[PDB]
Design a protein around this ligand. Structure first.
Ligand SMILES: COc1ccc(Cn2nnc3c2[C@](C)(O)CC[C@@H]3OC(=O)NC(C)C)cc1
Ligand SMILES: [Co+2]
Length: 369
């Protein structure tokens, strides 16, 4: 089985042995002390511990190969003139095929972010959004795939005007720097300091104005858990964070955001993204529309994120009040778009990394980024 063009063959059918490709494997960084981590590549106890979780790494890899193949395809056709709805639907149709969507066992982990310009994250269109992608837009494509709740969170920035090339380079190099700094026993604050030093080493000129690239101080990366996009540890992108350490076996989304604005986001625009609170249990609901919607969410999404378009496509309509009810009850949380000031430009790059016992794997690395 070879992949089609456009892609249509599930990743699982491309690897008939069930063994998916590794991402980029890295020796961990040396410690402050100067000692190397070459020993892990080998310490017998570590190779056995690594191999004990092989089925888990393999699930991440299948999801990452889906991510690589979807994003390559997206880059081939994403163009100004398309609506944001057209972009997201075309991306998602392919993602569903290549992940071999199967309820909660394999699917889309969260909505397709396509945040534009001063909006940095958490924008995807709702029904009726007429927004059209423009030549001068700076669009963050952030989409997730999962196999058995093993989530790939990985993102890149699309542009068409070369004026943004150095801003993209800055943020890419900052994200790569974060990825290199990361490791077992590494302090999360140190990762933030390193990212911020790289990002701020860049100056850019856009339409005759100069800027020093600012990390967006109130955005961050995050640990990832099973069916849990944000498992509760934050990876800062500026100095001054927590000295909490990264641990063996954790998984992290190492994302950085750069801006030519204030370097701070606020909530703006209509909300599209929602997710069940992971920590809320069963709550009996008698209100019939509210009950029905929560059942739909439990069946289709569980604790994974969703958006309004994804309810629409299941045949739900006139659900907004019931969705507001679930938010007000604290069962569902809303995740509105996050924007810097009007006229600013924001960029993002992101990978998922596995802190395996024998090495650090940038599982979502491709030949693209
Ligand atoms: C509903 O769909 C999702 C999808 C991903 C996430 C995961 N997430 N959690 N926080 C953030 C993210 C994003 C979407 O990665 C972007 C970064 C943002 O950092 C942030 O807000 N930091 C403040 C809390 C200080 C959440 C919900
Ligand atoms: Co992301």
């Amino acid at each position: 089985k070879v992949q089609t063009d456009p892609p249509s063959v599930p990743i699982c059918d491309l690897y008939p042995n069930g063994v998916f490709p590794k991402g980029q494997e890295c020796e961990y960084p040396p410690t402050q002390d100067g000692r190397t981590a070459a020993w892990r590549t080998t310490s017998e106890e570590k190779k056995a511990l690594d191999q004990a979780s092989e089925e888990i790494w393999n699930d991440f890899r299948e999801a990452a190969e889906a991510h690589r193949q979807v994003r390559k395809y997206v880059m081939s056709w994403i163009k100004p003139g398309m609506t944001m709805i057209e972009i997201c639907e075309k991306l998602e149709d392919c993602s569903r095929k290549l992940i071999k969507e199967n309820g909660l066992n394999a699917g889309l982990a969260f909505p397709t972010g396509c945040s534009l310009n001063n909006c940095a994250a958490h924008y995807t269109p709702n029904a009726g959004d007429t927004t059209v992608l423009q030549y001068d837009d700076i669009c963050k494509i952030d989409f997730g795939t999962h196999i058995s709740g093993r989530i790939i969170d990985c993102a890149f920035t699309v542009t068409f005007n070369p004026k943004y090339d150095t801003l993209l380079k800055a943020v890419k190099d900052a994200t790569n720097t974060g990825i290199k700094c990361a490791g077992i026993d590494v302090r999360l604050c140190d990762v933030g300091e390193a990212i911020q030093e790289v990002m701020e080493s860049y100056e850019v000129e856009i339409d005759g104005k100069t800027y020093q690239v600012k990390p967006i101080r109130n955005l961050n990366g995050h640990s990832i858990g099973q069916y849990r996009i944000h498992a509760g540890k934050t990876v800062p992108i500026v100095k001054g964070g927590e000295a909490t350490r990264m641990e063996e076996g954790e998984v992290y989304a190492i994302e950085t955001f750069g801006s030519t604005g204030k370097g701070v986001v606020h909530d703006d625009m209509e909300c599209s993204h929602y997710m069940k609170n992971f920590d809320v249990g069963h709550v009996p609901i008698r209100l019939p529309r509210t009950k029905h919607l929560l059942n739909v969410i439990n069946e289709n999404f569980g604790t994974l994120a969703f958006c309004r378009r994804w309810l629409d496509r299941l045949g739900e309509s006139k659900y907004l009040m019931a969705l507001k009810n679930l938010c007000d009850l604290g069962i569902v949380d809303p995740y509105p778009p996050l924007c810097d000031i009007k006229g600013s430009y924001t960029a993002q790059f992101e990978h998922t990394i596995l802190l395996r016992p024998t090495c650090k794997e940038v599982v979502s690395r491709g030949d693209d980024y």
